[PDB]
C-alpha cells in the first residue's frame, strides 16, 4: 500500500517501465515488442547494457517490493541470487536451492524466481537447468539467451 512514481527507458529489449516508492524500487517491467531508488535503477540498467565493463561500480537501488519486506524462502532465494551470481556466471536451479539453505527445494526456487519483481537486477536469467540446458525464462527464452550472450556465456544465443 505504497505510493509510487514511474519512469521509463529504452533498451536493446524494448522499453522498460520502472516503478518504485521513496523507500525503494518495486518492479521492472518489459513492454517492447526522479527519486533516488529509481534514479539509481535507470543508471544501473544503462551501465548494464552499454558500459558493462564496470557494472559493479554502479550502486544497487534499495528494493521495496512486498516480497523483500518480510522474511520468506522466496526472499532468501532472490537475495542470495543477487549477492553471489555475478555477471558472466550461471547457477543451476538445484544449486540455488542449496545456496538458499535447502538443497531439496528446487521446485520452490523455480517458483520463487517466477515471482521476481526486478529482472536482471536480480539475475533470474543466470539460473539455468543444467550445464547444457539453459532452461526456461519468464521473460521469454530468447531474452535469456540474449542476456547470457550479452554476458559472453556459452549458453547465450543472439
Ligand atoms: C525472472 C523473471 C520473472 C518475471 C519476468 C517477467 N515476466 C513476467 O512478468 C510475467 C508476467 C506475466 C506472465 C503471465 O503469464 O501472465 C508471465 C508469463 C509466465 C510466467 C511464469 C511462467 N512459469 C512459471 C511457467 C510461465 C509464463 O509464461 C508466459 C507465457 C506468455 N506467453 C506464451 C505469451 C506470456 C507470459 C508468461 C511472465 C522476467 C524474468
Ligand atoms: Zn514501497
Numbering used by the authors: 4 to 36, 55 to 179
Sentences reproduced from the published study:
The self-labeling protein tags (SLPs) HaloTag7, SNAP-tag, and CLIP-tag allow the covalent labeling of fusion proteins with synthetic molecules for applications in bioimaging and biotechnology. The three most popular SLPs are HaloTag7 (HT7),14 SNAP-tag (SNAP),15 and CLIP-tag (CLIP)16. To guide the selection of an SLP–substrate pair and provide guidelines for the design of substrates, we report a systematic and comparative study of the labeling kinetics and substrate specificities of HaloTag7, SNAP-tag, and CLIP-tag. We complement these kinetic studies by reporting crystal structures of HT7 and SNAP covalently labeled with rhodamine-based fluorophores, providing a detailed understanding of their substrate preferences.
SNAP was engineered from the human O6-alkylguanine-DNA alkyltransferase (hAGT), a protein involved in the repair of alkylated DNA by transferring alkyl moieties to its reactive cysteine. SNAP irreversibly transfers the benzyl moiety of the substrate to its reactive cysteine, leading to the release of guanine. The structure shows the same α/β topology with two domains as observed for hAGT and other SNAP structures. The TMR moiety strongly participates in the crystal packing, engaging in interactions with the neighboring xanthene ring and protein in a sandwichlike topology. As a consequence, and in contrast to HT7-TMR, SNAP does not interact with the bound fluorophore in the X-ray structure presented here. In the crystal structure of TMR-labeled SNAP, a structural ethylene glycol forms hydrogen bonds with both the backbone carbonyl oxygen of I31 and the carbonyl oxygen of the amide linking the benzyl to the fluorophore. This benzyl-fluorophore amide is also forming a hydrogen bond to the backbone carbonyl oxygen of residue E159 via its Nα atom. We modeled the SNAPf mutation E30R in the structure of TMR-labeled SNAP to gain a better understanding of how it affects the labeling kinetics. The results suggest that an arginine at position 30 could interact with the carbonyl oxygen of the amide group in the label via a moderate hydrogen bond (3.2 Å), replacing the hydrogen bond observed with the ethylene glycol in the crystal structure. This could lead to an increased affinity for the substrate or a better substrate positioning for labeling.
